[PDB]
Write a structure and sequence with these properties.
homotetramer, 316 residues, D-Maltodextrin-Binding Protein, domain 2, 2 domains, eight-stranded mixed beta sheet, 7 helices, 23% strand, binds adenosine monophosphate, binds 6-O-phosphono-beta-D-fructofuranose, binds magnesium ion, metal-binding (chains A, B, C, D), phosphoprotein (chains A, B, C, D), acetylation (chains A, B, C, D)
């Protein structure tokens, strides 16, 4: 008769103790947890406009609560044109890259939406600026996401693993429900917006055909595409398979953004033992040039991402 | 200011007053609302097994709260083999066909799931049995669904229209947010599990390729397929387009069941002003033989459903 | 299993059905329930000024949700100088006298506060005015209160009895927990603000000393006085004893007001089977002259109220 | 658009950093916060028996969640006859003395009830036992209480002050609403169960008379006595005055218990700058002999406790 032993607050504080931290990253991670519970509650009474305004309130809660951690120096949002450089009084050493509410366009239809964040330690000697945001994702300290779906889950990936925490909204505590999550090696679902079929490169084309009409005449792959990144990525982690948003007429730049959509999700993928590629390079090694830079991303189970990379290599 | 101006309790009772009834259907409709609020509650914590534990809880909540309205004589659940005949002391004159929790499968992946219902009046003077449930959905008195997605919505369709109500979980009250919902004439999203492409009839095949490669220089349609009927159908109703679960050889009579999944959603679509076909006949005119009868279903905006029906007819 | 077996929505509508009414009082009684759930919500956060901000919010919620029932023609609030006459487009036939939030004072000290109401039918064919509210509480159609204490309870008394309903805030539903509540004949707790002992008439003085020093070797009565009428009266109803707010020179007509505090609680007490006197006449038989008229009140178990009334009569 | 800057988690972690703690007392204080939110939620749906069973669940949540902190070695509850000595694997260095749910007898009447806790650092070299609980309250590290009233508040008193945190139940976060709370020097309310008037010593008797018929002929003191300790003590802290539960026929032992009712509350009182006396000695200096030992307590504003101590001294 308990609150199932490992709550998020407890877990973060123990992992901060084991790593002999200053308590600055714990304060930061405690602040993202308060922010996500305030966004989950606002998402759930979705109006008692509400896309533009709920995305605005979400932006405002993540920025104000993160400044209050006294742990950040630069903040990058999908919503703000330029980076937020924190006030010298509130400055800590972390750079945080976030999407306060992914899939806002889907709010009206009531589709699962989510918050995506990546945390970097500030590296330079220089007075904080946009430049400190621009590290490859290989340099991420912690990264993860909250999914506001049928229930709200937080997936936190750090250096040592991926852990899933389910909000108990009755007490406002995230409980550890799944630990050291590893993705399947080969799954059975492919996920892409097939309305772009005529824009696709010939490797993506060949692959999709291979999943629908398997040459070895095994069972085809199911298709699922919620059209909300956190939800398609999350389903992939749990059930297995591949998620694709390649280059097509959105240039070989693609739609999703590197710093706050692709990199957090790629870090979660490599940590649960899967892959994240642009088709050419690993997403985590790309050196950013802009904070709102976009990148192709293909991620998911290992044996499904390698099979497509083989087709990519066959078209060279 | 207020809680809302029109609640599902104010609305339901106002309509029973305008309609001049003994208050029995009102009781049934208020019992449905208590049941939805309770399942929403259980769905939003989920785990503080998931799948075949929550849908068992949901079966239980609905059966129990409906017998207590003293308004039902026959209940048909997805979960139960046979039609439940209510004890005479609790019998009323209605037959309710329901899906306790659609897409329960998806609890682990946290995808939008929902509750589906249709209410038929008993009209057959004889001791109530399965018999009374085997009516064409053209005979529905009321139908609708509750969607547990990023927020909870109850959509209810009756004689006079389709109305959408958002749950405010802070006060446990459904508030009318959308009045006399009517679907767009032509949409721009098609929704089908393309992984069955190996098995699709040619009318479905010409349609999808015309959606991906328009003969003229149209923008192709976007594709979305959550894999949960209430979420896909709700997006359709709200934003336009078409949802198809055609006949294919793995489940050659379609997958979805007529009484509790197909008919409520066909009725909601027809009152919103869109179409719902088998491909050969309309879903609402089919007469059941079995309470668990499956049926094919193509539904959505009138112009796009028509455009596929012509292709069905083009194959003769 | 269920949400509950009998909800305040099931009960209210079942009674309107048994009673054979146009469903107008039902609408009013369902509007009261929405209003109580919303104030409970605001009372339980309190501060995320308190006092004259929350009671202003509560005044607002009640007036607004009652006009919207289209069931009220005159409203009397503690908060407003004059009786509010409802616009003809929203007028119905009832007069509601209410205290939006009793004991608002105590929000800072976090003591149990409550909402008090009495409903009178208009019976006076003339354009509605204050006039219609100035009826003896013997004329009440329904009365009761909501108590925001450790849990929320709504107690409603009508013709046929007093029933207690507990709010389940998880589903926003009031569940019948106590049916046909009847008060104990003799209690063992007296409740008065003894700091006015300098000003009390001698009948009150002989009573209290007989409670503290029984002439025989009885156990003396315990004393409790929360200082919030709904909490003191609720304890009385539920556990027995007497609550006294006698006449004294600072407020010589008593403090508590007849229409919205005294009469509802006198009516609840009389249907629970206890007594409610001024000391000289019963509170329910007094005819108002002013909507904000004050009145003395002694109420509780029949044997203890009697025992003080004899001492009043012993002084002649 | 925030979660009003200083949440309890943030405050505790900063104060743990400033004191260069190991993070063991932060883990303990984070665990009492989870426990209090799980008890507040259970208290608020008070049954959807429930006195004996809710006090039992409360006991079980505080013990299981405190063991899980890995910060305690001995636990003393009102509910357990003997002290709980923790398992060597879960052992930390703190002794915690608590009342999991004060005022449970009042649950049926819906009176404010609360949780009271005192934390001691274990002092001996010896294998932990009842003996480590038995320190004077002068040796308390931290002490405080949660009040489940109109809203839920946590009052935390530590070496440097008293801070009041209001639960925002919407997000499950305690927000700092009042800091470095100091009690008034003289208030205007006295609080005692006057049903014991004939059991009272002559100093308590003289005092009460002095408050009701003030010799200097100033204004009498109001009386308030909820009969729930956390609620009478809390009202005293905020509004001022005195709270008394002296010796009478419950011997010069009194009813309230030293380790978990009186000492936490006395520590809060001295820290907000008031007094807590048995009439003879300060409650914080008493050397306990038993864990379930009782003690007289008189606490509140300074100028009111000294005035009574003068009367105590006059009766010698
Ligand atoms: N939960 C955590 N809290 C704080 N630091 C952590 C955590 N997990 C890992 N770390 C390591 O802790 C150092 C950060 O310390 P500081 O920024 O003073 O809190 C880094 O070496 C991160 O790798
Ligand atoms: N909100 C409603 N309440 C009750 N009956 C309704 C409602 N809306 C439509 N009806 C019509 O009311 C009749 C049901 O009355 P009864 O079964 O006595 O409650 C039917 O003719 C339904 O078409
Ligand atoms: N639950 C209830 N709903 C409606 N009216 C009720 C209820 N309980 C008692 N009544 C009686 O119903 C009549 C009110 O009918 P009407 O004003 O058309 O709604 C009155 O005679 C009240 O005494
Ligand atoms: N919030 C707090 N967290 C931990 N220790 C605290 C706190 N506030 C004061 N202390 C001091 O911290 C020491 C406890 O350290 P430790 O038990 O390793 O956590 C003691 O000297 C307490 O006085
Ligand atoms: O380009 P489309 O088909 O409109 O899909 C966009 C959606 O897909 C994603 O890129 C990935 O789910 C979302 O971030 C976005 O809302
Ligand atoms: O995953 P599949 O085989 O495409 O089936 C999807 C269908 O099955 C369900 O998940 C359950 O019937 C529906 O919600 C959905 O339309
Ligand atoms: O504090 P006093 O003067 O005894 O007055 C108490 C009375 O006033 C109120 O707090 C407000 O009318 C009542 O709830 C209560 O019965
Ligand atoms: O002795 P009495 O009058 O029953 O009062 C007991 C109540 O008073 C207190 O001792 C102090 O409020 C409570 O702990 C307890 O429930
Ligand atoms: Mg995005
Ligand atoms: Mg189904
Ligand atoms: Mg009042
Ligand atoms: Mg106690």
């Amino acid at each position: 008769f308990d609150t199932n032993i490992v709550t998020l607050t407890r877990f973060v504080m123990e992992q901060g103790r084991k790593a002999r931290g200053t308590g600055e990253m714990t304060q930061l991670l405690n602040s993202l947890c308060t922010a996500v519970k305030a966004i989950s509650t606002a998402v759930r009474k979705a109006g008692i406009d509400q896309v533009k305004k709920l995305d605005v309130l979400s932006n405002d809660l993540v920025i104000n609560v993160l400044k209050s951690s006294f742990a950040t120096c630069v903040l990058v949002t999908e919503e703000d044109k330029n980076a937020i450089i924190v006030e010298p009084e509130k400055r800590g050493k972390y750079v945080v890259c976030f999407d306060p509410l992914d899939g806002s366009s889907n709010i009206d239809c009531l589709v699962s939406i989510g918050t995506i964040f990546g945390i970097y330690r500030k590296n330079s000697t220089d007075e904080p600026s946009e430049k400190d945001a621009l590290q490859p994702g290989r340099n991420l300290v912690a990264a993860g996401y909250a999914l506001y779906g049928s229930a709200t889950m937080l997936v936190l990936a750090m250096v040592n693993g991926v852990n899933c925490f389910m909000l108990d909204p009755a007490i406002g505590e995230f409980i550890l429900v799944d630990r050291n999550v590893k993705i399947k090696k080969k799954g059975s679902i492919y996920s892409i917006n097939e309305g772009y079929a005529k824009e696709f490169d010939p490797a993506i084309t060949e692959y999709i055909q291979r999943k629908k009409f398997p040459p070895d005449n095994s069972a085809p792959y199911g298709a699922r595409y919620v059209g909300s990144m956190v939800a398609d990525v999350h389903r992939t982690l749990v059930y297995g398979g591949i998620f694709m948003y390649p280059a097509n007429k959105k240039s070989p730049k693609g739609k999703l953004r590197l710093l706050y959509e692709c990199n957090p999700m790629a870090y979660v993928m490599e940590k649960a033992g899967g892959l994240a590629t642009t088709g050419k390079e690993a997403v985590l090694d790309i050196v950013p040039t802009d904070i709102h830079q976009r990148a192709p991303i293909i991620l998911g189970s290992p044996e499904d991402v390698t099979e497509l990379l083989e087709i990519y290599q066959k078209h060279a």
